[PDB]
Amino acid sequence: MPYPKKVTIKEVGPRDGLQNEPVWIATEDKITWINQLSRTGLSYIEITSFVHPKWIPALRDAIDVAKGIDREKGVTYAALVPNQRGLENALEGGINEACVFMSASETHNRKNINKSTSESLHILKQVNNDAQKANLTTRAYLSTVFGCPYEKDVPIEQVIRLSEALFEFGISELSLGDTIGAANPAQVETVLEALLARFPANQIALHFHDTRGTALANMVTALQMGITVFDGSAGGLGGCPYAPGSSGNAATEDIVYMLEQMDIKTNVKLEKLLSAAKWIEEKMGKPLPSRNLQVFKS
Amino acid sequence: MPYPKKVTIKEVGPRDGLQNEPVWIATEDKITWINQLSRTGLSYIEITSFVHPKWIPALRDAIDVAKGIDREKGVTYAALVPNQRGLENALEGGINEACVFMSASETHNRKNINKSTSESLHILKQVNNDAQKANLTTRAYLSTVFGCPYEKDVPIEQVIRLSEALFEFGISELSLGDTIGAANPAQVETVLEALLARFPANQIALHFHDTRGTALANMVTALQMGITVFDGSAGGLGGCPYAPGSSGNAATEDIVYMLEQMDIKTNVKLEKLLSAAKWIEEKMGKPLPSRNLQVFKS
């Protein structure tokens, strides 16, 4: 019933945020910004993605940035890993944790990484095995769990099914996401109700997109169900490809702020975060959706 | 426990929204926009404020707009009424409901309408008496209930105290607001817990400001406590004077949307609302904070 005392939030701006922005950030600047983040209080940061540069030109400097960051203690630096070939590069970059990914929706999956849910499942399976065998912590990113942009509705049995497989492989955390951004507190409650009744809440994270501005709202419902892991993007970087001109993931600072007022520890020094958000915003030459960032700019 | 089946949302954009925008909307345009709203599905709209034009130059055309609107059936057209002199003008305008107002915080009250809580209380007391005597429904707007920009913290006993007086006068609904916009789901829960335990939930409305982007979040908590009346502003019109450059009240469409996905009836045809939001946004020449409006603009 009572809200948790501490909740760990994971920053994914330098990755999910930058690869979703139609602007190229100088390879150096990325480092400079990630450095700020490192000494912000956050304990987890997806510095980049090791997907072939052809598909993610905005992050073609993955290997370079992975070796440029300051890398602070107590901080878990992670990177998206598409497959073994990618895990290889990630290993050279020094990434602590590898995050595999796939879609719950067949249509979305096949039309994103071009592979059936089974095929992908098989990939991650071994991609996870080799990762751990290299003394690397793994994390899974199951997308389109709250609805698909193509299939629209997504059955709960699918999520459960996949989720069982993912956990069976040996992953450490399954991050469920709201790709299209059409989840409501009611949906997140029935969904987490069916999931939490089979997997440990400690091993489940949530990645909400407030394309409809319901992220924080969904977060509260989740906080009530027991989830204590939430993904965020500094400044709210990253637009929704399904709906251009609209915000993507929830602004990390907005998440950190509200949690603080609720007397929930995040160990994140908001002040610093806010300063960091403003930085990229300036390098972006475009205003970020973050509400507290605006307040910060007084 | 289970979320309510129906929730009435009140539009206050043409008033709280326009008087908070550093731009003058042609008296006619206001009418044209309020007309759209009237046939949007909303059943309540504060068309304007009858405070002396000297303080609210953006709404100096109150009496003019009050007679220009189309005025649809089943729609409750309300206006802000500062005192008897104002109630007089409102009466000529045809306003169905008068909304008195005051601050819970002494400092805020005295530094806004320049009168102690008692003095104001005394005003509203008789201002309400004359209103009803004229066959007019009354509503009270208690502000700074979740914190003051000056006194910062605000004791719950104060709200209760005033709230008891307000209800004792004969008002029909007490709308509690988050002026500074620094309320969290935890605060709205303890607050509504202490209030709902003395006054009927049906006679209590909430006016949240997502200056910190926590509006909808706070709304969920409220929806869980029993409140079924929420104030909103089409497009998110109206900035926060305490923090310029940041959004004010929650975007009506965002509120209507989330509620719909949760299977809660608002009888508001979102599509129409969204269209209306875009309209003023264009007349504003500035983008509105509304998330769904952005999605609408595809």
Side-chain angles (χ1 to χ4, degrees), chain A residues 3 181-182 184-186 189 210-214 216-217 220-221 224 243-247 254 257-258 261-262 289-292 294-295 298, chain B residues 3 181-182 184-186 189 210-214 216-217 220-221 224 243-247 254 257-258 261-262 289-292 294-295 298:
Chain A
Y3 297 108
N184 51 270
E189 192 183 305
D210 68 312
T211 299
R212 260 59 185 279
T214 51
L216 264 49
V220 171
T221 299
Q224 287 180 172
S246 60
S247 43
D254 293 339
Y257 169 89
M258 183 193 59
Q261 308 305 300
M262 290 177 73
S290 174
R291 301 296 191 192
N292 282 82
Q294 306 312 302
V295 178
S298 296
Chain B
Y3 297 107
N184 52 269
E189 193 182 305
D210 68 314
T211 297
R212 261 58 185 280
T214 51
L216 266 49
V220 170
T221 300
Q224 287 179 173
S246 61
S247 42
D254 291 341
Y257 169 89
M258 183 191 65
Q261 307 305 299
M262 289 178 72
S290 175
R291 301 299 190 189
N292 280 83
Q294 306 313 302
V295 178
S298 295

Short mmCIF file of all heavy atoms in Angstrom, two decimals, chain A residues 3 181-182 184-186 189 210-214 216-217 220-221 224 243-247 254 257-258 261-262 289-292 294-295 298, chain B residues 3 181-182 184-186 189 210-214 216-217 220-221 224 243-247 254 257-258 261-262 289-292 294-295 298:
data_model
loop_
_atom_site.label_atom_id
_atom_site.label_comp_id
_atom_site.label_asym_id
_atom_site.label_seq_id
_atom_site.Cartn_x
_atom_site.Cartn_y
_atom_site.Cartn_z
N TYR A 3 3.80 3.87 -0.55
CA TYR A 3 4.82 4.02 -1.58
C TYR A 3 6.18 3.59 -1.07
O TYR A 3 6.52 3.81 0.08
CB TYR A 3 4.88 5.47 -2.06
CG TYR A 3 3.61 5.96 -2.71
CD1 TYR A 3 2.79 6.88 -2.06
CD2 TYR A 3 3.21 5.50 -3.96
CE1 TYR A 3 1.60 7.32 -2.64
CE2 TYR A 3 2.02 5.94 -4.55
CZ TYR A 3 1.23 6.85 -3.88
OH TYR A 3 0.05 7.30 -4.43
N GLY A 181 3.06 4.92 -26.58
CA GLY A 181 2.77 5.88 -25.53
C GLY A 181 1.29 5.99 -25.23
O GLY A 181 0.82 7.05 -24.82
N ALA A 182 0.56 4.90 -25.42
CA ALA A 182 -0.88 4.91 -25.18
C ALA A 182 -1.30 4.00 -24.05
O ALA A 182 -2.16 3.14 -24.21
CB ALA A 182 -1.64 4.54 -26.47
N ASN A 184 -2.59 3.78 -19.93
CA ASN A 184 -3.25 4.57 -18.90
C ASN A 184 -3.10 3.84 -17.57
O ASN A 184 -2.89 2.62 -17.54
CB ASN A 184 -4.73 4.72 -19.23
CG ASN A 184 -5.38 3.40 -19.50
OD1 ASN A 184 -5.42 2.94 -20.65
ND2 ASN A 184 -5.87 2.74 -18.45
N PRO A 185 -3.22 4.56 -16.45
CA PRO A 185 -3.10 3.99 -15.11
C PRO A 185 -3.94 2.75 -14.93
O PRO A 185 -3.62 1.89 -14.11
CB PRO A 185 -3.56 5.13 -14.22
CG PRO A 185 -3.15 6.34 -15.00
CD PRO A 185 -3.55 5.99 -16.39
N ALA A 186 -5.04 2.65 -15.67
CA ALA A 186 -5.90 1.49 -15.54
C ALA A 186 -5.26 0.28 -16.21
O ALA A 186 -5.26 -0.82 -15.66
CB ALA A 186 -7.25 1.77 -16.15
N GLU A 189 -2.26 -1.12 -14.50
CA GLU A 189 -2.60 -1.82 -13.28
C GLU A 189 -3.00 -3.25 -13.58
O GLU A 189 -2.56 -4.17 -12.89
CB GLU A 189 -3.73 -1.09 -12.57
CG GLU A 189 -3.99 -1.55 -11.16
CD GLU A 189 -5.17 -0.83 -10.53
OE1 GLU A 189 -5.16 0.43 -10.51
OE2 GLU A 189 -6.11 -1.52 -10.06
N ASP A 210 5.71 9.62 -22.53
CA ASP A 210 4.54 10.47 -22.33
C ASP A 210 4.17 11.25 -23.56
O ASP A 210 4.01 12.46 -23.53
CB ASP A 210 4.68 11.39 -21.11
CG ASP A 210 5.72 12.43 -21.29
OD1 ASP A 210 6.84 12.05 -21.71
OD2 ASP A 210 5.43 13.63 -20.99
N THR A 211 4.05 10.52 -24.66
CA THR A 211 3.63 11.11 -25.91
C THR A 211 2.23 11.67 -25.63
O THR A 211 1.82 12.65 -26.24
CB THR A 211 3.53 10.05 -26.98
OG1 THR A 211 4.82 9.46 -27.17
CG2 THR A 211 3.03 10.64 -28.26
N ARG A 212 1.50 11.05 -24.71
CA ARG A 212 0.17 11.53 -24.38
C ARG A 212 0.18 12.18 -23.01
O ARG A 212 -0.87 12.46 -22.43
CB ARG A 212 -0.84 10.37 -24.40
CG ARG A 212 -1.67 10.29 -25.67
CD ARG A 212 -0.81 10.12 -26.91
NE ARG A 212 -1.63 10.16 -28.12
CZ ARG A 212 -2.32 9.13 -28.59
NH1 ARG A 212 -2.29 7.97 -27.95
NH2 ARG A 212 -3.06 9.28 -29.68
N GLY A 213 1.38 12.40 -22.49
CA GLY A 213 1.52 13.04 -21.20
C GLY A 213 0.92 12.28 -20.05
O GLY A 213 0.42 12.89 -19.10
N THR A 214 0.97 10.96 -20.10
CA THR A 214 0.40 10.17 -19.02
C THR A 214 1.46 9.35 -18.32
O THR A 214 1.14 8.56 -17.45
CB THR A 214 -0.72 9.22 -19.54
OG1 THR A 214 -0.25 8.46 -20.66
CG2 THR A 214 -1.93 10.02 -19.99
N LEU A 216 4.03 10.03 -16.02
CA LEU A 216 4.10 10.14 -14.57
C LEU A 216 2.89 9.52 -13.91
O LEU A 216 3.00 8.88 -12.87
CB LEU A 216 4.28 11.61 -14.16
CG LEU A 216 5.72 12.05 -13.90
CD1 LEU A 216 6.62 11.63 -15.06
CD2 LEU A 216 5.74 13.55 -13.69
N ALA A 217 1.74 9.70 -14.54
CA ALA A 217 0.49 9.15 -14.02
C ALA A 217 0.61 7.64 -13.98
O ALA A 217 0.30 7.02 -12.97
CB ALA A 217 -0.65 9.55 -14.91
N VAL A 220 2.82 6.47 -11.14
CA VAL A 220 2.23 6.40 -9.81
C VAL A 220 1.55 5.06 -9.59
O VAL A 220 1.76 4.42 -8.57
CB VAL A 220 1.20 7.53 -9.58
CG1 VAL A 220 0.45 7.28 -8.28
CG2 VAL A 220 1.90 8.88 -9.52
N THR A 221 0.74 4.65 -10.56
CA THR A 221 0.04 3.37 -10.49
C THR A 221 1.06 2.26 -10.29
O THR A 221 0.88 1.37 -9.47
CB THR A 221 -0.75 3.11 -11.78
OG1 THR A 221 -1.73 4.14 -11.95
CG2 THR A 221 -1.45 1.78 -11.71
N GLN A 224 2.60 2.05 -6.99
CA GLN A 224 1.65 1.44 -6.08
C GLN A 224 1.64 -0.07 -6.21
O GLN A 224 1.35 -0.76 -5.24
CB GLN A 224 0.25 1.97 -6.35
CG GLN A 224 0.00 3.39 -5.90
CD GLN A 224 -1.42 3.84 -6.20
OE1 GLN A 224 -1.85 4.90 -5.77
NE2 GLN A 224 -2.16 3.02 -6.95
N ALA A 243 4.66 9.46 -33.95
CA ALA A 243 3.99 10.76 -33.92
C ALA A 243 5.01 11.89 -33.78
O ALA A 243 5.33 12.32 -32.67
CB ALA A 243 2.99 10.81 -32.77
N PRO A 244 5.54 12.39 -34.91
CA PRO A 244 6.53 13.47 -34.92
C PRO A 244 6.04 14.79 -34.32
O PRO A 244 4.88 15.18 -34.51
CB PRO A 244 6.89 13.60 -36.40
CG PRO A 244 5.60 13.23 -37.07
CD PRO A 244 5.16 12.02 -36.29
N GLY A 245 6.92 15.48 -33.61
CA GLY A 245 6.55 16.74 -32.99
C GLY A 245 6.05 16.56 -31.56
O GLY A 245 5.76 17.54 -30.87
N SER A 246 5.96 15.31 -31.10
CA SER A 246 5.51 15.01 -29.75
C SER A 246 6.62 14.36 -28.93
O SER A 246 7.44 13.62 -29.47
CB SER A 246 4.29 14.08 -29.79
OG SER A 246 4.61 12.86 -30.42
N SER A 247 6.64 14.64 -27.62
CA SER A 247 7.65 14.11 -26.71
C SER A 247 7.71 12.59 -26.71
O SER A 247 6.75 11.94 -27.11
CB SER A 247 7.42 14.63 -25.29
OG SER A 247 6.04 14.59 -24.94
N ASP A 254 11.76 15.26 -14.35
CA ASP A 254 10.36 15.29 -13.92
C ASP A 254 10.07 14.06 -13.06
O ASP A 254 9.31 14.13 -12.11
CB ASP A 254 9.44 15.29 -15.13
CG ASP A 254 9.55 16.56 -15.93
OD1 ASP A 254 10.01 17.58 -15.37
OD2 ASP A 254 9.16 16.54 -17.11
N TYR A 257 12.00 14.58 -9.74
CA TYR A 257 11.34 15.60 -8.93
C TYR A 257 10.12 15.08 -8.19
O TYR A 257 10.05 15.12 -6.97
CB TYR A 257 10.92 16.79 -9.78
CG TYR A 257 10.01 17.75 -9.06
CD1 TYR A 257 10.53 18.80 -8.31
CD2 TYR A 257 8.62 17.60 -9.10
CE1 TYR A 257 9.70 19.68 -7.61
CE2 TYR A 257 7.78 18.48 -8.40
CZ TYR A 257 8.33 19.51 -7.66
OH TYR A 257 7.51 20.36 -6.95
N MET A 258 9.14 14.61 -8.95
CA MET A 258 7.93 14.11 -8.34
C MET A 258 8.23 13.06 -7.28
O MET A 258 7.61 13.05 -6.23
CB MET A 258 7.02 13.52 -9.39
CG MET A 258 5.72 13.05 -8.79
SD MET A 258 4.69 11.94 -9.96
CE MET A 258 5.97 10.52 -10.22
N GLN A 261 9.38 14.78 -4.01
CA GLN A 261 8.29 15.40 -3.26
C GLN A 261 7.47 14.34 -2.54
O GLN A 261 6.85 14.62 -1.53
CB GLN A 261 7.39 16.18 -4.20
CG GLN A 261 8.14 17.15 -5.05
CD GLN A 261 8.97 18.10 -4.23
OE1 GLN A 261 8.45 18.85 -3.41
NE2 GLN A 261 10.28 18.08 -4.44
N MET A 262 7.47 13.12 -3.06
CA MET A 262 6.73 12.05 -2.45
C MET A 262 7.55 11.37 -1.36
O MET A 262 7.14 10.35 -0.79
CB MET A 262 6.32 11.03 -3.49
CG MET A 262 5.26 11.51 -4.46
SD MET A 262 4.89 10.15 -5.79
CE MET A 262 3.90 8.90 -4.68
N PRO A 289 10.89 19.01 -24.02
CA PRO A 289 9.58 18.93 -23.37
C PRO A 289 9.57 18.97 -21.84
O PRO A 289 8.53 19.24 -21.24
CB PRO A 289 9.00 17.63 -23.92
CG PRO A 289 10.22 16.79 -24.16
CD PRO A 289 11.16 17.78 -24.79
N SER A 290 10.72 18.70 -21.22
CA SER A 290 10.83 18.67 -19.77
C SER A 290 10.18 19.88 -19.09
O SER A 290 10.49 21.01 -19.43
CB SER A 290 12.30 18.63 -19.36
OG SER A 290 12.41 18.75 -17.96
N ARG A 291 9.31 19.62 -18.12
CA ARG A 291 8.63 20.69 -17.40
C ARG A 291 9.55 21.35 -16.40
O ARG A 291 9.65 22.57 -16.36
CB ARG A 291 7.40 20.17 -16.66
CG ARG A 291 6.35 19.52 -17.53
CD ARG A 291 5.74 20.48 -18.52
NE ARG A 291 4.56 19.88 -19.15
CZ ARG A 291 3.94 20.37 -20.22
NH1 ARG A 291 4.38 21.48 -20.79
NH2 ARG A 291 2.87 19.75 -20.72
N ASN A 292 10.23 20.57 -15.56
CA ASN A 292 11.13 21.16 -14.59
C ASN A 292 12.30 21.88 -15.25
O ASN A 292 12.84 22.82 -14.68
CB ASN A 292 11.67 20.12 -13.62
CG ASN A 292 10.68 19.77 -12.55
OD1 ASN A 292 9.78 18.95 -12.77
ND2 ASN A 292 10.81 20.39 -11.39
N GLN A 294 12.09 23.76 -17.78
CA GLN A 294 11.59 25.11 -18.05
C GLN A 294 11.62 25.92 -16.77
O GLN A 294 12.07 27.07 -16.76
CB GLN A 294 10.17 25.07 -18.61
CG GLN A 294 10.03 24.18 -19.83
CD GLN A 294 11.11 24.45 -20.86
OE1 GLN A 294 11.26 25.57 -21.34
NE2 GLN A 294 11.87 23.41 -21.20
N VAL A 295 11.15 25.31 -15.68
CA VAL A 295 11.13 25.96 -14.38
C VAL A 295 12.54 26.31 -13.96
O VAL A 295 12.80 27.38 -13.41
CB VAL A 295 10.51 25.04 -13.31
CG1 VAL A 295 10.55 25.72 -11.94
CG2 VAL A 295 9.09 24.69 -13.70
N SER A 298 14.16 29.24 -14.98
CA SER A 298 13.43 30.32 -14.31
C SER A 298 12.63 31.14 -15.31
O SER A 298 11.52 30.68 -15.69
CB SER A 298 14.39 31.23 -13.54
OG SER A 298 15.04 30.54 -12.49
N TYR B 3 -12.06 2.82 -10.06
CA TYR B 3 -12.23 4.18 -10.58
C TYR B 3 -13.69 4.44 -10.93
O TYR B 3 -14.40 3.55 -11.41
CB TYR B 3 -11.36 4.38 -11.82
CG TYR B 3 -9.88 4.27 -11.56
CD1 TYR B 3 -9.16 3.16 -12.00
CD2 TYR B 3 -9.20 5.25 -10.85
CE1 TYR B 3 -7.79 3.03 -11.74
CE2 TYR B 3 -7.83 5.14 -10.58
CZ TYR B 3 -7.13 4.03 -11.03
OH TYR B 3 -5.78 3.91 -10.77
N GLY B 181 1.68 24.89 -8.10
CA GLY B 181 1.82 23.67 -8.88
C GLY B 181 2.81 22.70 -8.28
O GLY B 181 3.45 21.92 -8.99
N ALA B 182 2.95 22.73 -6.96
CA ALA B 182 3.89 21.84 -6.28
C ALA B 182 3.20 20.81 -5.39
O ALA B 182 3.49 20.72 -4.20
CB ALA B 182 4.88 22.67 -5.47
N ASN B 184 2.03 16.66 -4.97
CA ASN B 184 2.39 15.31 -5.40
C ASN B 184 1.29 14.36 -4.96
O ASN B 184 0.55 14.65 -4.02
CB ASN B 184 3.71 14.87 -4.77
CG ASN B 184 3.69 15.03 -3.29
OD1 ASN B 184 4.08 16.08 -2.77
ND2 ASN B 184 3.22 14.01 -2.58
N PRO B 185 1.18 13.21 -5.63
CA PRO B 185 0.17 12.19 -5.33
C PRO B 185 0.11 11.84 -3.87
O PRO B 185 -0.91 11.40 -3.36
CB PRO B 185 0.59 11.01 -6.19
CG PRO B 185 1.23 11.68 -7.37
CD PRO B 185 2.07 12.75 -6.72
N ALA B 186 1.22 12.03 -3.18
CA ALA B 186 1.23 11.70 -1.76
C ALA B 186 0.52 12.80 -0.99
O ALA B 186 -0.26 12.52 -0.08
CB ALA B 186 2.66 11.54 -1.27
N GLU B 189 -3.19 12.96 -1.41
CA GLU B 189 -3.86 11.86 -0.75
C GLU B 189 -4.11 12.18 0.71
O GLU B 189 -5.21 11.96 1.20
CB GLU B 189 -3.02 10.60 -0.87
CG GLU B 189 -3.74 9.33 -0.50
CD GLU B 189 -2.82 8.12 -0.60
OE1 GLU B 189 -2.23 7.89 -1.68
OE2 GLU B 189 -2.70 7.40 0.42
N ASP B 210 -0.01 21.76 -13.85
CA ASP B 210 1.15 20.90 -14.03
C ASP B 210 2.41 21.67 -14.40
O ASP B 210 3.09 21.35 -15.36
CB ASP B 210 0.90 19.76 -15.03
CG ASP B 210 0.72 20.25 -16.44
OD1 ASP B 210 -0.04 21.23 -16.61
OD2 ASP B 210 1.32 19.66 -17.37
N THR B 211 2.69 22.69 -13.60
CA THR B 211 3.89 23.48 -13.79
C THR B 211 5.07 22.51 -13.60
O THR B 211 6.13 22.69 -14.16
CB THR B 211 3.98 24.58 -12.74
OG1 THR B 211 2.88 25.48 -12.90
CG2 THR B 211 5.28 25.34 -12.89
N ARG B 212 4.86 21.46 -12.80
CA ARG B 212 5.88 20.46 -12.58
C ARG B 212 5.53 19.16 -13.29
O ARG B 212 6.14 18.12 -13.07
CB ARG B 212 6.06 20.21 -11.08
CG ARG B 212 7.24 20.94 -10.47
CD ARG B 212 7.17 22.45 -10.65
NE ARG B 212 8.38 23.10 -10.15
CZ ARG B 212 8.63 23.35 -8.87
NH1 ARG B 212 7.74 23.03 -7.94
NH2 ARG B 212 9.77 23.93 -8.52
N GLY B 213 4.52 19.25 -14.15
CA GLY B 213 4.06 18.10 -14.90
C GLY B 213 3.57 16.96 -14.03
O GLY B 213 3.76 15.80 -14.38
N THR B 214 2.92 17.26 -12.91
CA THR B 214 2.43 16.20 -12.04
C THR B 214 0.93 16.21 -11.93
O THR B 214 0.35 15.43 -11.18
CB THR B 214 3.06 16.28 -10.62
OG1 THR B 214 2.91 17.60 -10.11
CG2 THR B 214 4.55 15.95 -10.65
N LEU B 216 -1.76 15.30 -14.03
CA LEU B 216 -2.47 14.07 -14.29
C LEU B 216 -2.19 13.02 -13.22
O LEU B 216 -3.07 12.26 -12.85
CB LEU B 216 -2.11 13.56 -15.68
CG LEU B 216 -3.04 13.95 -16.82
CD1 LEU B 216 -3.32 15.42 -16.82
CD2 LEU B 216 -2.41 13.53 -18.12
N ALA B 217 -0.95 13.01 -12.72
CA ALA B 217 -0.55 12.08 -11.67
C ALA B 217 -1.37 12.34 -10.43
O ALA B 217 -1.91 11.43 -9.82
CB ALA B 217 0.91 12.25 -11.37
N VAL B 220 -4.92 11.10 -10.81
CA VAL B 220 -5.17 9.69 -10.60
C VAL B 220 -5.42 9.43 -9.12
O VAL B 220 -6.38 8.77 -8.75
CB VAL B 220 -4.00 8.83 -11.08
CG1 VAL B 220 -4.19 7.39 -10.62
CG2 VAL B 220 -3.92 8.89 -12.60
N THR B 221 -4.54 9.96 -8.28
CA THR B 221 -4.69 9.80 -6.83
C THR B 221 -6.07 10.30 -6.40
O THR B 221 -6.76 9.65 -5.63
CB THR B 221 -3.60 10.58 -6.08
OG1 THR B 221 -2.32 10.11 -6.48
CG2 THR B 221 -3.76 10.40 -4.58
N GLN B 224 -8.89 8.17 -7.28
CA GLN B 224 -8.93 7.04 -6.37
C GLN B 224 -9.58 7.40 -5.04
O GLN B 224 -10.15 6.54 -4.38
CB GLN B 224 -7.53 6.53 -6.11
CG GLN B 224 -6.90 5.77 -7.25
CD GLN B 224 -5.48 5.32 -6.91
OE1 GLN B 224 -4.85 4.57 -7.66
NE2 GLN B 224 -4.97 5.78 -5.77
N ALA B 243 6.29 31.23 -12.11
CA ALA B 243 7.38 30.66 -12.90
C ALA B 243 7.09 30.82 -14.39
O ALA B 243 6.49 29.94 -15.02
CB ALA B 243 7.56 29.19 -12.56
N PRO B 244 7.51 31.96 -14.99
CA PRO B 244 7.29 32.24 -16.42
C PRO B 244 8.00 31.27 -17.36
O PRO B 244 9.12 30.82 -17.10
CB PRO B 244 7.81 33.67 -16.56
CG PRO B 244 8.92 33.73 -15.55
CD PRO B 244 8.29 33.04 -14.36
N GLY B 245 7.33 30.94 -18.46
CA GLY B 245 7.90 30.02 -19.42
C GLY B 245 7.48 28.58 -19.15
O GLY B 245 7.84 27.68 -19.90
N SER B 246 6.73 28.37 -18.08
CA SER B 246 6.26 27.03 -17.73
C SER B 246 4.73 26.95 -17.82
O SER B 246 4.04 27.94 -17.56
CB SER B 246 6.73 26.65 -16.32
OG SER B 246 6.22 27.54 -15.34
N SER B 247 4.22 25.77 -18.17
CA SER B 247 2.77 25.55 -18.30
C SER B 247 2.00 25.82 -17.01
O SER B 247 2.57 25.81 -15.92
CB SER B 247 2.49 24.12 -18.78
OG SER B 247 3.32 23.17 -18.13
N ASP B 254 -5.74 16.56 -22.52
CA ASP B 254 -4.92 15.52 -21.91
C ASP B 254 -5.70 14.83 -20.81
O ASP B 254 -5.59 13.63 -20.60
CB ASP B 254 -3.65 16.15 -21.32
CG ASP B 254 -2.71 16.67 -22.38
OD1 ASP B 254 -2.85 16.23 -23.55
OD2 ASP B 254 -1.84 17.50 -22.05
N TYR B 257 -8.47 12.78 -22.49
CA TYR B 257 -7.92 11.60 -23.11
C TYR B 257 -7.64 10.50 -22.11
O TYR B 257 -8.19 9.40 -22.21
CB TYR B 257 -6.63 11.93 -23.86
CG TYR B 257 -5.85 10.70 -24.32
CD1 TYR B 257 -6.11 10.11 -25.55
CD2 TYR B 257 -4.89 10.12 -23.50
CE1 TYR B 257 -5.42 8.96 -25.96
CE2 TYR B 257 -4.19 8.96 -23.89
CZ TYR B 257 -4.47 8.39 -25.13
OH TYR B 257 -3.80 7.25 -25.52
N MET B 258 -6.78 10.79 -21.16
CA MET B 258 -6.44 9.78 -20.19
C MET B 258 -7.66 9.15 -19.53
O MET B 258 -7.71 7.94 -19.32
CB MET B 258 -5.53 10.35 -19.12
CG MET B 258 -5.09 9.30 -18.15
SD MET B 258 -4.25 10.12 -16.66
CE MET B 258 -5.76 11.09 -15.96
N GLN B 261 -9.27 6.57 -21.94
CA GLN B 261 -8.56 5.30 -22.01
C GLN B 261 -8.83 4.47 -20.76
O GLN B 261 -8.78 3.25 -20.80
CB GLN B 261 -7.07 5.56 -22.13
CG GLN B 261 -6.71 6.48 -23.26
CD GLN B 261 -7.27 5.99 -24.57
OE1 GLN B 261 -6.92 4.90 -25.03
NE2 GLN B 261 -8.14 6.79 -25.19
N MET B 262 -9.12 5.14 -19.65
CA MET B 262 -9.39 4.44 -18.41
C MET B 262 -10.83 3.99 -18.33
O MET B 262 -11.27 3.48 -17.30
CB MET B 262 -9.07 5.33 -17.21
CG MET B 262 -7.59 5.59 -16.98
SD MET B 262 -7.27 6.80 -15.46
CE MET B 262 -7.73 5.57 -14.04
N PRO B 289 1.41 23.90 -24.40
CA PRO B 289 2.00 22.73 -23.74
C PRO B 289 1.29 21.39 -23.91
O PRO B 289 1.88 20.33 -23.67
CB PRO B 289 2.06 23.17 -22.28
CG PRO B 289 0.91 24.12 -22.16
CD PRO B 289 1.04 24.93 -23.41
N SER B 290 0.03 21.43 -24.33
CA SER B 290 -0.77 20.22 -24.49
C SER B 290 -0.07 19.13 -25.27
O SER B 290 0.41 19.36 -26.37
CB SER B 290 -2.09 20.56 -25.19
OG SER B 290 -2.79 19.36 -25.45
N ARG B 291 -0.02 17.93 -24.70
CA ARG B 291 0.63 16.80 -25.35
C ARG B 291 -0.24 16.26 -26.47
O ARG B 291 0.26 16.02 -27.56
CB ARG B 291 0.90 15.68 -24.36
CG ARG B 291 1.78 16.05 -23.19
CD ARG B 291 3.16 16.49 -23.60
NE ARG B 291 4.03 16.59 -22.44
CZ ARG B 291 5.24 17.12 -22.46
NH1 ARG B 291 5.74 17.60 -23.60
NH2 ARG B 291 5.96 17.17 -21.34
N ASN B 292 -1.52 16.03 -26.21
CA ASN B 292 -2.38 15.50 -27.26
C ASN B 292 -2.57 16.47 -28.41
O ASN B 292 -2.83 16.06 -29.54
CB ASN B 292 -3.74 15.07 -26.72
CG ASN B 292 -3.69 13.70 -26.05
OD1 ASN B 292 -3.32 13.60 -24.88
ND2 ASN B 292 -4.04 12.65 -26.79
N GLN B 294 -0.26 18.22 -29.68
CA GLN B 294 0.88 17.97 -30.57
C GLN B 294 0.61 16.72 -31.41
O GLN B 294 0.82 16.71 -32.63
CB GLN B 294 2.17 17.79 -29.77
CG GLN B 294 2.45 18.96 -28.83
CD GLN B 294 2.29 20.31 -29.51
OE1 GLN B 294 2.95 20.60 -30.51
NE2 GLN B 294 1.40 21.15 -28.97
N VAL B 295 0.14 15.66 -30.76
CA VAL B 295 -0.18 14.42 -31.44
C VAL B 295 -1.26 14.67 -32.49
O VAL B 295 -1.22 14.13 -33.60
CB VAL B 295 -0.68 13.36 -30.44
CG1 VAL B 295 -1.05 12.07 -31.16
CG2 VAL B 295 0.38 13.09 -29.40
N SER B 298 -0.55 15.80 -35.72
CA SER B 298 0.17 14.70 -36.35
C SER B 298 1.63 15.05 -36.57
O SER B 298 2.40 14.93 -35.58
CB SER B 298 -0.47 14.33 -37.69
OG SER B 298 -1.78 13.81 -37.53
#
